[PDB]
Amino acid sequence: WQSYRTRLNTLFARQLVARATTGIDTILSMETQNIQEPQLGKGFYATFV
């Protein structure tokens, strides 16, 4: 509505299940959380210091 954008779909559910099926420590790893999602519409990725 305002320039805010909020992703309501996540596509890695299949990958997430697969990674979980191995072991408890596979799904709860930090690296299970780093799996990326496509960006919201258009938009410009940047880092500020």
Next chain:
Amino acid sequence: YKNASMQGLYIFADMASKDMTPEQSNVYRDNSYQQFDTNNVRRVNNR
């Protein structure tokens, strides 16, 4: 047998296969060998 070629793979907590580099595999050989065995006979493995 020492300094002979050897291959290894890491299995991390979450399941992943990381192939071992000849230098790594070697440095694990040095303390590893004599826990594994020759023809017809077998040894045991430990940490």
